[PDB]
């Protein structure tokens, strides 16, 4: 075949990075790229990569080390980033003939965030710092975070958080709530595109509750067999996206309403990862 299928679920960062992968393939090879950027949740991406692009699936997507380690493989979360990466790389190769390429450079871990003003008022840097004053505070959180021991239940047990109220707030309700001081803490991905524009600060998970969540492209071995050049092409992205860069791209989409495909391609051009005329 001469076509490769890049997938993403419906979420800003995923769509941006999947578009980057597609642009790199289109700029450095003659392969046709099908972008399947509307996959659902519940590990559909993973099921899709096991089918492959030739079987109504996908060939490549960007996965996070801790999700592969804990959710897909069922391994303990408390590990160092390199260990998590090497474990997922070895195990995905052995079990499914899927190849983890090099990390993009950022760790999009889940976190708790506060207004920068509150952080400076109480000198907050870590989750433990927040727990010490949590009895004065209200948490506004997404529904997924409040359900399941991997979210707030386990975090609260580990840190002894004592928030006065924990309010279920989906959509962008919790951002408005924290802006209005109706809540004082919200949950967020570390690369959330609204963190800077809302003057929010991410706190450190000092007890290491959350696993490393380093983004990396993963690809079927049989696609690399047909098109070995893809390895080096996609590894041109290695360590090219820092946390701050990713957050800025997410902001261009979520805060400024820009087209994620344009955001992705313009970032690549600005970094010299594709040519100005590509």
The token pair that represents 54 in the structure block: 């030739």
Please say whether the beta carbons of 249 and 115 come within 8 A: no
Look at the chain and count its residues.
278
Q: Half-sphere exposure of residue 201, counting CA atoms within 13 Å on the CB side?
A: 18
CA distance 1 to 205: 45
Round to whole Å and give the CA distance between 216 and 239. 10
- Alpha-carbon gap, residue 63 to 69, rounded angstroms: 11
d(CA 207, CA 32): 45
Residue 249 near residue 131, CB atoms below 8 Å:
no
Q: Where are the alpha helices (DSSP H) in the chain?
A: 12-28, 44-51, 65-66, 81-96, 116-122, 127-133, 143-146, 152-159, 173-179, 221-226, 229-235, 243-254, 260-270
The DSSP element (H or E) to which 217 belongs, if any, is strand 215-220
Compute CA distances 73 → 66, 90, 154, 189, whole Å: 10, 11, 20, 22
Cβ neighbours for 132, distance < 8 A, ≥ 6 positions apart:
none
32 φ/ψ sector (left φ>0, alpha ψ -120 to 50, else beta)? beta
Look at residue 86 and give its three-state secondary structure: helix
Identify the CA nearest to 77 among candidates 15, 164, 149, 133: 149
Contact 4, 230 (CB under 8 A): yes
Read off the DSSP letter of residue 205.
Answer: -
Spatial separation of the C-alpha atoms in residues 85 and 90, rounded to whole Å: 9
Cα–Cα nearest to 254, from 194, 197, 202, 170: 194
Give the integer Cα–Cα distance in Å for 102 and 232.
10
Confirm if 230 and 26 have CB atoms less than 8 A apart. Answer: no
SS3 228: coil
Write down the number of H helices and E strands in the chain: 13, 10
List CB contacts of 55: < 8 A, sequence separation 6 or more.
Answer: none
C-alpha atoms less than 13 angstroms from C-alpha of 159 in its C-beta half-sphere? 27
Report yes or no: 59 and 219 within 8 Å, Cβ to Cβ.
yes
- Nearest Cα neighbor of 215 from 88, 26, 39 is 88
Does residue 178 contact residue 9 with C-beta atoms inside 8 Å? no
Angstrom resolution of this structure? 1.3
- List of long-range contacts for 35-38, beta carbons under 8 Å, 24+ apart: 35/6, 35/8, 36/5, 36/6, 36/7, 36/8, 37/6, 37/7, 37/8, 37/10, 38/10
For the chain, the C-alpha Rg in angstroms (whole number) is 19
What is the distance between the alpha carbons of residues 72 and 46, in angstroms, rounded to a whole number? 9
CA 37 to chain centre: 15
Nearest Cα to Cα of residue 61 among 102, 14, 93: 14
Pairing of strands 215-220, 98-100: antiparallel
- Domain borders along the chain are 1-108+213-278, 109-212
Question: Smallest Cα–Cα separation from 177: which of 140, 135, 137, 146?
Answer: 140
Method: X-ray
């Amino acid at each position: 075949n001469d076509t490769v299928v890049v997938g993403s679920i419906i979420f800003t960062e995923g769509i941006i990075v999947a578009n980057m992968v597609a642009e790199m393939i289109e700029a450095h090879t003659d392969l046709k790229v099908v972008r399947k950027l509307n996959l659902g949740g519940y590990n559909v991406n993973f099921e899709a990569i096991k089918r492959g692009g030739a079987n109504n699936g996908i060939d490549i997507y960007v996965e996070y080390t801790g999700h592969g380690l804990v959710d897909i493989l069922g391994f303990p979360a408390t590990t160092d980033p390199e260990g998590a990466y090497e474990t997922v790389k070895k195990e995905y190769k052995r079990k499914w003939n899927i190849v983890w390429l090099k990390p993009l450079g950022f760790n999009n871990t889940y976190t708790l965030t506060v207004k920068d003003e509150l952080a400076k008022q109480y000198n907050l840097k870590t989750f433990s710092d927040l727990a010490k004053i949590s009895d004065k505070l209200i948490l506004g959180a997404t529904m997924w975070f409040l359900e399941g021991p991997d979210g707030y239940p386990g975090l609260q047990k580990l840190y002894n958080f004592k928030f006065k109220h924990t309010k279920s707030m989906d959509m962008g309700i919790r951002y408005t709530a924290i802006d209005n001081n109706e809540v004082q803490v919200i949950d967020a991905w570390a690369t959330d595109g609204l963190l800077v524009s809302h003057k929010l600060k991410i706190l450190e998970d000092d007890k290491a509750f959350f696993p490393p969540y380093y983004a990396a492209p993963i690809i079927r071995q049989d696609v690399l067999d047909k098109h070995p050049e893809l390895k080096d092409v996609l590894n041109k992205l290695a360590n090219q996206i820092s946390l701050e860069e990713m957050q800025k791209l997410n902001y261009k989409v979520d805060g400024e309403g820009q087209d994620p495909a344009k955001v992705a391609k313009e970032f690549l051009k600005e970094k010299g990862l594709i040519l100005q005329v590509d």
